[PDB]
């Protein structure tokens with residue numbers, strides 16, 4: 115079967131549960147890739163495969179091939195070698211508003227395409243944004259869903275605690291706007307280097323999120339601009355319908371500079 119026929123397997127790049135990512139080479143092509151090897155809910159596997167295919171965009175990991183073998187499934191992507199956005203925040207502590215703004219721009223373009231194609235990711239966070247002034251590529255479509263335009267339903271309780279929308283935590287129906295909440299949380303980290311909602315106790319984390327209990331504490335927020343904090347407030351609006359859309363967030367002056 116076609117992957118163990120055509121490809122050699124090298125060094126592990128990442129690992130969740132379910133999945134391992136390793137560098138592979140298409141031997142006859144002399145071409146390196148990332149292979150997401152999945153260690154075989156078959157419905158959810160083919161969905162992530164279909165969604166990865168759907169999405170061709172500078173800011174979205176580009177699926178080269180999907181291969182089904184005895185016991186393993188391979189989703190092969192173009193190799194992006196710049197590391198998680200997560201790692202770069204750790205190393206640099208935080209981004210200049212200059213660098214934060216080009217970054218969240220990169221992210222909003224990916225989120226805008228996803229939404230235009232009726233895909234909601236639901237697990238936006240730095241670990242799932244990969245670097246190539248290096249452009250940011252959205253990854254891990256393992257939790258992604260398909261919506262019809264502005265439809266909102268209960269699609270299930272899924273994602274990363276720190277990043278989860280109020281609507282999802284209340285078990286209210288939801289859609290595209292949960293990605294914009296995650297973008298708010300991301301943007302806030304970019305600017306100062308910790309999240310808006312932290313707590314040892316998950317239950318109290320979830321109370322904060324549902325209640326929008328974020329501040330811009332002194333001293334570190336005092337020199338951050340009005341335009342930046344404006345975007346975070348519009349992204350971190352509890353009302354999903356009132357929340358800034360991806361398209362509206364690209365036309366925001368902090369992102370436009372126009």
Ligand SMILES: O=C(O)/C=C/c1ccc(O)cc1
Pocket residue numbers: 127135148150175191192193194195244253254255
């Ligand atoms: O969709 C994913 O989960 C990961 C994709 C991926 C693409 C290129 C890499 O270098 C590493 C991971």
